[PDB]
């Protein structure tokens, strides 16, 4: 319903619709793991070496595992990313990197976490007011208001540095912040055009299941068919540079028309806060992204290849004690996303 002569004050930083989206995604994520097989039985000492290749991202590890009978044992070996494994005996002895902190649960292989868009709808007695102001900056009076019972479908995409499957700005790149001037706050950038990004896990993998108990299965990486190559993402180079030019033109509105803007890479810390990450094909990718933020913009076909790392034990919501284990994905993964925006500081 377009509301003729109706204006209202909006504040995206105090929007409890966001708070619910956050709260609910976490609750469903956890609910989905309740019926799945636990991997706490895998907190064992592992003997480990490197995976054969010519000259070590992947580890070749083995251990004494339980079987369907409690009094029997089997020798099990599998392939692991080194990022999920820690050396303890300073073959060398290793343990899974999360055994001193959390329970690890295997996600059921039959359950998809694809960010299928959903609509949020108001209950009786309530209504959702919305802006049609294409220049609205996420705060303050909104000159053109209409109302709905339900929002547009929103994909619950989980990411860090880049936003890969959201909406585009209607006209111009929009830059929004709680303050802009406050260095303690984030600046969110919404592109008015998509940037194509092509990500892959260029390794043909196999998977095997291990019966570790009564209907209790563990999914292990079998081996790699063909070459072993690093995961990576391809970003259109020309598009990216044009995109940054637009971002800079808009950023300058708050910094000065002749102010020089520089894009630098991230600060140090855990991969979850220093790299770009996403879940695609069932794998959790961590991308270096420094190739995207390495330029200075001064007033007056090709691609960028970003190496990526992959992990299987994920502390999904930055909580301690609840770790999810991503079972191996067979075959080769190819993902194409729309960069729709950035989170910058």
């Amino acid at each position, epitope marked *: 319903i377009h509301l003729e002569n109706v204006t209202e004050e909006f504040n995206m930083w105090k929007n409890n619709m966001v708070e619910q989206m956050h709260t609910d995604i976490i609750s469903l994520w956890d609910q989905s793991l309740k019926p799945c097989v636990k991997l706490t039985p895998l907190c064992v000492t592992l003997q480990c070496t490197n995976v*054969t*290749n*010519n000259i070590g991202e992947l580890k070749n590890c083995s251990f004494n595992m339980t079987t369907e009978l409690r009094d029997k044992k089997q020798k099990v070996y599998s392939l692991f990313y080194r990022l999920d494994v820690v050396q303890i005996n300073e073959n060398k002895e290793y343990r899974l990197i999360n055994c001193n902190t959390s329970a690890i649960t295997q996600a059921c292989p039959k359950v998809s976490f694809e960010p299928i868009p959903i609509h949020y709808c108001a209950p009786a007695g309530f209504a959702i007011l919305k802006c049609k102001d294409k220049k609205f900056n996420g705060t303050g009076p909104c000159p053109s208001v209409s109302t709905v019972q339900c929002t547009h479908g929103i994909k619950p995409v989980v990411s860090t540095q880049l936003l890969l499957n959201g909406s585009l700005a209607e006209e111009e790149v929009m830059i929004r912040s709680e303050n802009i001037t406050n260095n303690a706050k984030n600046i969110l950038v919404q592109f008015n055009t998509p940037v194509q990004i092509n990500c892959t896990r*260029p390794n043909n993998n196999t998977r095997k299941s291990i019966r570790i108990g009564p209907g209790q299965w563990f999914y292990a990486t079998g081996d790699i068919i*063909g*070459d072993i190559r*690093q995961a990576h993402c391809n970003v259109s180079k020309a598009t990216w540079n044009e995109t940054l030019g637009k971002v800079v033109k808009q950023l300058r509105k708050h910094f000065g028309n002749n102010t020089i803007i520089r894009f630098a890479n991230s600060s140090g810390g855990d991969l979850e806060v220093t790299t770009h990450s996403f879940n695609c094909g069932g794998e959790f990718f961590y991308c270096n992204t420094s190739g995207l933020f390495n330029s200075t913009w001064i007033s007056n076909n090709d691609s960028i*290849t970003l190496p990526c790392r992959i992990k299987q034990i994920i502390n999904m919501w930055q909580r301690i004690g609840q770790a999810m284990y991503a079972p191996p994905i067979q075959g080769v993964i190819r993902c194409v996303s729309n960069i729709t925006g950035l989170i910058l500081t």
Partner: antibody, heavy 132, light 106 residues
Framework: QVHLQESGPGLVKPSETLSLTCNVSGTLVRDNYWSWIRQPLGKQPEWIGYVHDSGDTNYNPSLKSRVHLSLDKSKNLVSLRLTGVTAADSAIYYC??????????????????????????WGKGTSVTVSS | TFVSVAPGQTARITCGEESLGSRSVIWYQQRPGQAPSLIIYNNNDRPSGIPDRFSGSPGSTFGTTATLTITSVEAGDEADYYCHIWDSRRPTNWVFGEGTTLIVLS
């Protein structure tokens, strides 16, 4: 046509240093990559190593501590020096001109490729044994 | 290891272990008393002077050994066929793989 002429005594004492020479003609030894190969009787050939310039040399790891290769551009000769010779080193030794190619399997920028070698020009070989 | 081929028949020569990764096979034919002579490099590249009857298997496969097909075998092709193999998932081979004698039954 490049002519590779392997030469040596054909017999070296046990616990002795062996030195073979390949007389290169029709090309400059410094421009080509050179390699040595040997073939013990009844066996398939073994690479010994390769030599060229700018540190771009390599050796069979079993002979790495025993073999030293050198190219003398002023004589246009390829030298092969093998120490510690024993009965196991009896073989026909060959001089060959090696070419280097490349095979790419991955991203390139991540060095997901390798160089491969093949030998286009071969000499006749020199049969060298080890004996009192 | 040998293959018995009547003149005009096709030789089927194999060499080496199964590929793990991308491979580059170099084949040489050594006539008795001669230095090995290159016939195929990079799986199927034949240097000038080498007949088209010599055709190698691709290096795109995995789980396979090197294979050389020699069609229309002539008495002059009698030789020991050896291969040297480069594989992205294995350490450098400083030696040749055991070859196959091609015996022409003329």
């Amino acid at each position: 046509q490049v002519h590779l002429q392997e030469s040596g005594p054909g017999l070296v004492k046990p616990s002795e240093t062996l030195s073979l020479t390949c007389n290169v003609s029709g090309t400059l030894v410094r421009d080509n990559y050179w390699s040595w190969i040997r073939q013990p009787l009844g066996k398939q050939p073994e690479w010994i190593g390769y030599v060229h310039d700018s540190g771009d040399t390599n050796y069979n790891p079993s002979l790495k501590s025993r073999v030293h290769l050198s190219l003398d551009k002023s004589k246009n000769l390829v030298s092969l020096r093998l120490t510690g010779v024993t009965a196991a080193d009896s073989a026909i030794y060959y001089c060959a001109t090696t070419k280097h190619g490349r095979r790419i399997y991955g991203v390139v920028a991540f060095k997901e490729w390798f160089t491969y070698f093949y030998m286009d020009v071969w000499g006749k070989g020199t049969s060298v044994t080890v004996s009192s | 290891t040998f293959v018995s081929v009547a003149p005009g028949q096709t030789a089927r020569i194999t060499c080496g272990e199964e590929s793990l990764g991308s491979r580059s096979v170099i084949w040489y034919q050594q006539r008795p008393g001669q230095a090995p002579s290159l016939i195929i490099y990079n799986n199927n590249d034949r240097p000038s002077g080498i007949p088209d009857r010599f055709s190698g298997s691709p290096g795109s496969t995995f789980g396979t050994t090197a294979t050389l097909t020699i069609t229309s075998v002539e008495a002059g092709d009698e030789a020991d066929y050896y291969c040297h193999i480069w594989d992205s998932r294995r350490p450098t081979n400083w030696v040749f793989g055991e070859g196959t004698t091609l015996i022409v039954l003329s």
